[PDB]
Amino acid sequence: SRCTHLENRDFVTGTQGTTRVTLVLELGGCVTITAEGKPSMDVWLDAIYQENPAKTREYCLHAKLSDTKVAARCPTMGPATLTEEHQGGTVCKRDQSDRGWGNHCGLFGKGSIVACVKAACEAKKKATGHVYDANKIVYTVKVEPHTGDYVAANETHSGRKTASFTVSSEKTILTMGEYGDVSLLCRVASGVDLAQTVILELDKTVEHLPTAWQVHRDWFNDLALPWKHEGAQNWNNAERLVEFGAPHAVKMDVYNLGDQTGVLLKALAGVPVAHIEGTKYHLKSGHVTCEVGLEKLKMKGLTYTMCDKTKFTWKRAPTDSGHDTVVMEVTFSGTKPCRIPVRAVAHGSPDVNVAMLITPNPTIENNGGGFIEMQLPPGDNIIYVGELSHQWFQKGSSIGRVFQKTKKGIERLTVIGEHAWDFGSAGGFMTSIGRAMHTVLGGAFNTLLGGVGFLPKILLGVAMAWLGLNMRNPTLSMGFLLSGGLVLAMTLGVGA
Amino acid sequence: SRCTHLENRDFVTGTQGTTRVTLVLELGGCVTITAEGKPSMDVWLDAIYQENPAKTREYCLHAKLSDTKVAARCPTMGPATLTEEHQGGTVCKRDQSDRGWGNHCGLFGKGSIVACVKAACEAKKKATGHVYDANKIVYTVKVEPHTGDYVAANETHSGRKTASFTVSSEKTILTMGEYGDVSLLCRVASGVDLAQTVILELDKTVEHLPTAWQVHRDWFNDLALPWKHEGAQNWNNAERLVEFGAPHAVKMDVYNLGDQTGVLLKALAGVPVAHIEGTKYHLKSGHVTCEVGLEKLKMKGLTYTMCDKTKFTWKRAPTDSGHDTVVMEVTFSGTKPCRIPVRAVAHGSPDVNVAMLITPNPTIENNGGGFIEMQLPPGDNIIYVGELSHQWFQKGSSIGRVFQKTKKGIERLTVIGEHAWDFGSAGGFMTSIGRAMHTVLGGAFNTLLGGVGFLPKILLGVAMAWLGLNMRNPTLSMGFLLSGGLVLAMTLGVGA
Amino acid sequence: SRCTHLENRDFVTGTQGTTRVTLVLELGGCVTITAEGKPSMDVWLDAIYQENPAKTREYCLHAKLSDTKVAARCPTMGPATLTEEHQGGTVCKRDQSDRGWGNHCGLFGKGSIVACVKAACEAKKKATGHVYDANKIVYTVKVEPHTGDYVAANETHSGRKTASFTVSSEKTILTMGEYGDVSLLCRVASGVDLAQTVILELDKTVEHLPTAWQVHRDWFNDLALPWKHEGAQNWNNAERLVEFGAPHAVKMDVYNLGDQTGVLLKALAGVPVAHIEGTKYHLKSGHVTCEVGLEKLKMKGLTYTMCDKTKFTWKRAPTDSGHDTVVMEVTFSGTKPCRIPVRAVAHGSPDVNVAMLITPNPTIENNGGGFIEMQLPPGDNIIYVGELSHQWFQKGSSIGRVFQKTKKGIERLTVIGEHAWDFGSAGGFMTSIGRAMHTVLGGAFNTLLGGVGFLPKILLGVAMAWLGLNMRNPTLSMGFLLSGGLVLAMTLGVGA
Amino acid sequence: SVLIPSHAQGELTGRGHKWLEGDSLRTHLTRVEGWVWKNKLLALAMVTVVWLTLESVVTRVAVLVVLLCLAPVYA
Amino acid sequence: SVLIPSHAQGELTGRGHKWLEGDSLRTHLTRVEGWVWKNKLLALAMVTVVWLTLESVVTRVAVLVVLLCLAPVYA
Amino acid sequence: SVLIPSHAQGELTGRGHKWLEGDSLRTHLTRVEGWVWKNKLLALAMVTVVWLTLESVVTRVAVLVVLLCLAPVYA
């Protein structure tokens, strides 16, 4: 199970007779779905990508300057003039120099001087924005069954099957081997908002930088650099990287503002990273909402004999997964295809097997098997596999389990926003008021405050609350107290 | 008369009894001495420099990284360590990877990972500080006698004399041919503060930047960058150009924050430029208090014959200098060594001469002569040179000239500060009141608000005055209105 | 009868229908079980150990220093720098020495000096910490039947049986010879908290110290000494045992703070001892909870005939055990095997036998037997073995017995904590309340004040009582008096 | 990360070429005006709410300038 | 090429690797101590003029607690 | 077993080297300034119980200096 490899594991379960479950799948997440009398199944989103997305603006990070010229005119000889003021790709300034007999004029006073320089970009110094097309995005959802066997992060599990999704191809059926068939519906609408998201590329060749950043479109439109669209030979606003010295007699200096006078470091701090792999432009932070059908699934080996109880040995003695579960592996010797007689018991009444098996109906097959995952009540238990027996102490308490499940819940809200309500083995009427309140309040907070920094959002919230205390009208006072407290709480919503 | 070439010129008047004058000579300025019965002198400060100043810190603006290495150990198997972790010229991070059975560990929990990378500066990307030595600095002062001869800003006056002053130099004399001698003293301890001043050098060969900048020492000594002193092989500050990605199970990626030249050049906005010329490091803003003595000066040619009034012809007709003076050049056809009969008349009253000459006792000599400069009262005038005449309308007013000297005083007092009271042909008791009150009231502002920025100085000054309108006693209200007004008055001049 | 050799002994009782007893067994403790009509047993914990526990930190108690080197620079000549600053196994400091003409410098002022020395540990001067693995600990429990023969301490008894418990065990069954089988189950988790204990080793070859100490883990992580983990050659924090002299012009002393062994042995005052034996690492404090089942035990010698009442003689006369029991031994000359007619009586009635025997159905064997232990009521008594008669006077009283049995219970509660409620052969309602109150109120005290020093805890308790007397609110006043008393009682119950 | 705070503007003696004219009123005034052109809905809400809530013209003027000049500064 | 704004901390989805971290109040409140502990000096006493100016303990504490996160934040 | 109390600053050769310079005033002030940043939350309980129970600013200040001087003597 690939689900054991990640810290960000999740579990959701189908009740008696429930044939369908709705999931939200995320690039850094993994869901084990279990339902009564169906094989346990792991589902995750492995990629979101497009090939060769459309270029938008190119921006210049380091100007090259060349072929500077100047012209100047004596007092009352009228304004100085150059051919280069009319061309493309030149930056120029027109200014006045003090003149007199000492610099070969006939009168003392102010002359006129004009200075020019060609502007270009250095060989690999461009920031490029690329934008996704909803008609060509590929999502990629993968499924793995609990085959009762174990694999590393760097091993090829034969039970993994893959399904690509795009707007022309929302549904697919996968054959999981002897475990039967599974049905996936992915809406490729919803998910990442491709209208707001730009993929920013600097230079793929650099040894010690990530290949791209996942930048917001309203920020990217405001970069105060020189800029162009693709194919153009001349740069808009090239004066934004050139400054002109104070004029002296018949000469005037031209200066750069310097190498990498642009986007890297302190501007992009906190932006998600993205990755470029040949033609593919992957996001590396994002999601899809997906419905899984559990009708056509089968459980292997319900016809097998149980093991001869004496003939086991441990291959991996019990350990704690970190997900509030116990994992273990057994070796066996004897008649090959068999059920494993697994159970566990507390210091209460001994007839009660307390183990919830996460691997349903575990087996040893001819080639492999004998891994088990299970969940237990808090406190002191003994775990059994035939005549192998091993004491176990389970951490936490019935209250501690709930506080952890609540924190995971709040975190999914703070990451996903309103789509978080679609995660569940149910879709009952209370989900509609949940999404309705989240749609209104989320839209309101985004509309007013979407570009405001963390600190000024807190200052606004404190101002609203303090004005609410100072207001003489009780209706306005209470509205300012409620809205100020909410603005503070949902500003602070960056974690749990 | 070199002091006509600059936009900036001053006049000091030596009435009889003035054998010596005190000046504060400045780079980017010139002073003319007009002494009663003695030749007029041009005097100015021409360079402040040292050959090969001492290096202080070198900083690196762009990191080169190589040979990255990583090592990790399983949970409870003890912390990871690697041979480069104790060498010079390496950056390292110690961190806690999450590990478990999927990543080849025996247990699920936090492990240990260590990452290493070498660091160097790219070949041209340094910033080098240099510092002056008061025992080796050279100040250069020049003098030029009013020979009545005009040569352009790009050619050499024969009568121009140089004095080069160090801490070794006493009162020094310059022999000016027939005009006599000028005797001159420069006070090296009464000029630039060499403790607080640093010269900053990036790369000299960059074609479109100035060759050096002048910076304050208590800014240069606390930049957040990698630093070194000359000839050392390794960089000596906990690395600020290198950064470490969040750890995977068995890998951790190193990042380079790239070239800082653009953020440095932005942070230097507002500093004076400097210059480097071979081995010589020049300041291009600065001053020295200097004392000039006149008892050894003579008017040339006071025994010479008068000219033939009829034999003059113009070579360059009367025009305005921009300094409220009239300038001209004349030619003579008679026997050359003689005194020119210059005079000027208010239109309609030929009895009174109104020519205040700046060239005392004008002459023609066999090798050259005939430049004249004078100041005339506003309105209609006639200018004469023998039987030549020209009619001149002098622009301005008596009020406009008093306003111009007022403005020029406030400018020098703003730029040069406390030393500006020492400028003049006098030292009477009022000057001690001025310099004392400037030292105390200006010293209070410099002590309390030194290093506070322009905007926050304005906000604090305005707030202190505005709160001053509503304080709990009229003594405090007045005191905080007065001190708030003083803070704004100092700030809105140049106290940024 | 091993329970007679020891200063600590507990007695447990039960009716025919009890079948199972729950015990807490302790190192240096001992339990005798006296269920109705069953052969009595002694049970004790003999050892808690692991072979070769894993090393945590090593610490150095005596720094060895060698090959010191020093380098220094004149004022304004930059920092001093030396090769040994960038190696493993060196410790260094830099400082500003005073310089001038008298030590070959051109300027008077603060120079720069760096001093370096190599650091190591002397040959046997380490402390090593060791930690247990819960999967490898062995607990050894021993059982002995009351066979009616006496074997001394420091000689071997044939009837003793050994059970070795590790995390992979359930119930075990020991065949106690002709007395049938005893069934025993150990909970290997809980009681001792193996995550909080470090076995500390200094040097096993020293003749006059314990081989190891049972130190607390939170204390051992905070030792301010040089440290490393196994197999590394360099020491971390070596600057904890070198301290440097004030600098001279071109020299600076290195001083060694010497062997710390004595300071550590003083800091460990009040920590229990531990023992090392070849590969074994024993604790000499700790406890385990066991359930022991009596159902398969057989009474020996119920079929045999009575002894001849006339043929006994004493071997050990009736003597006080110190455990409120009488101990005696008899020799017999009749036919064997046979049953000893033993009884005891009080002067108030010659018919009523008042002997509460500990040895059930005592016998003479063909090659052993003849020892009896019994409890008698307070007052004046006669003990009979056939025609042997011996007077007795039993010390103490019924109220004195109730006190000593209550006192010994408080010793379990203070030494063992919440596990004190598990000790017993039968249930009762107040044991459910007592465990709840102890785990709640003791949990609160350990949460809020746990690690705080003894005198500070008293001062805080006395301050709480002072606040209770002085604060004007009567509800807060009584709450401070009640809570201050509880804090003081639990504090005085652990001491210093 | 590298930080290089701007040099204090008035501390050095003038009358020669300075590298650039300082941030002064120019950079501040254009930064404040540019923020009002972007966060239009919030800027209009802030000025109208302050104008409808605070009890004098002088305390309104003070709060309006403070809230404007400290809003865009975090870069 | 000046006044590139710092990217907003909101609306971009998380749960994968970011480039660096910063600009929340948890970080930003710590930045200004490096000015207050060395440059502010005599002006650290301005807590007294704010305290003596405003009307009551609850208003003095409220204005000081907010001023400490914005008033020294001039750059 | 053996205990050796280190002696006061009575003997003072005025111009010669000390051994380890355990000069108590500046050292204990440094220890107090460390303790109030490491154990920072506990100062709130100590100041509030004094502020609530003692009836004047004079008697509050008189104990608080002594209490904060005593704080690092215990753990």
Author numbering:
A (entry chain B), B (entry chain A), C (entry chain C): 1 to 496
D (entry chain D), E (entry chain E), F (entry chain F): 1 to 75
Paper text:
The E protein is a class II fusion protein and the largest of the structural proteins. It is the main protein responsible for receptor binding and fusion, as well as the major target for neutralizing antibodies. The prM protein is a precursor that is cleaved by the host cell protease furin into mature M protein and a pr peptide.
We thoroughly characterized a chimeric virus containing the prM and ectodomain of E (ecto-E) proteins of TBEV in a LGTV genetic background. We determined the structures of LGTV and chimeric LGTVT:prME using cryogenic electron microscopy (cryo-EM) and three-dimensional image reconstruction. In one of these three, we modeled two alternative conformations for residues 25–74 of LGTVT:prME. One conformation is identical to LGTV and TBEV, maintaining the pi-stacking interactions between M residues Trp37 at the raft interfaces, as well as the salt bridges between Lys40 and Glu33 of the respective chains, whereas the alternative conformation disrupts these tight interactions. The observed attenuation might also be due to sub-optimal interactions between the prM protein from TBEV and the C protein or transmembrane domain of the E protein of LGTV.
